Design a protein around this ligand. Structure first.
Ligand SMILES: [Ca+2]
Length: 225
């Protein structure tokens, strides 16, 4: 009810971009394509896509750079497309805020699964208030606060914190978090990277966490509320 979600494809491989256009539209998405990193900020602001698929190695400005630019602008989900030939490290992209990455060549069904995993949130979510350590979360309002002041988080950082806060006594391994938050049915550094990005925003002192705790040897868990 009733409008199509919109994906921006940022890739200079015009054949793959054409195929992605065809596959995504048959799945019910609207799509647009650009072929140069220098066009991305204007494209995102003009189209407001629900998600961006982003080639790591691009003309004009590479994918790590595009990331940093778009993340200064919004939390819009970004999935990096990587290839074994890439000459730059996809981890710098994740550290800059890319939510996820998929290796070329990929099957279009796995690509579509990655897209849908980032777009699971309903409109009009049921009422739900959580707390974790000294942080409050109003889930359907997408608002995290400490002493009433809001803490800004990307949707991925928000989903990570909510999963810990919902089960404050649970220790989550990294594979368990990948599957639960990222939605896989492989790379657990994704979890490490985004934990650090989340801590950098919600911790009074990120070197000494109270909100998101490391359980050495096992995983992570909610701080003592
Ligand atoms: Ca490329």
């Amino acid at each position: 009810d009733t409008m199509r979600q919109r994906i921006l494809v940022v890739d200079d491989d015009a054949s793959l971009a054409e195929m992605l256009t065809i596959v995504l539209r048959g799945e019910g998405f609207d799509t647009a394509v650009i072929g140069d990193g220098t066009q991305a900020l204007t494209a995102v602001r003009e189209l407001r896509p629900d998600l961006v698929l982003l080639d790591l190695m691009l003309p004009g400005m590479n994918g790590i750079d595009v990331c940093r630019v778009l993340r200064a602008d919004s939390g819009v989900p970004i999935v990096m497309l990587t290839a074994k030939t890439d000459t730059v490290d996809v981890v710098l992209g994740l550290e800059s805020g890319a939510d996820d990455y998929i290796m070329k060549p990929f099957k279009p069904k796995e690509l579509v699964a990655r897209v849908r995993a980032r777009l699971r949130r309903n409109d009009d979510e049921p009422a739900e208030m959580l707390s974790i350590a000294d942080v409050e979360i109003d889930v359907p309002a997408h608002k995290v606060t400490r002493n009433g002041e809001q803490i800004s988080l990307t949707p991925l950082e928000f989903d990570l914190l909510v999963a810990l806060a919902r089960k404050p006594r649970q220790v989550f391994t990294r594979d368990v978090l990948l599957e639960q938050v990222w939605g896989y049915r492989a790379d657990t550094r994704l979890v490490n990277v985004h934990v650090q990005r989340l801590r950098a925003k919600v911790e009074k002192d990120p070197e000494n966490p109270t909100v998101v705790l490391t359980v050495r040897g096992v995983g992570y868990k909610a701080g003592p509320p």
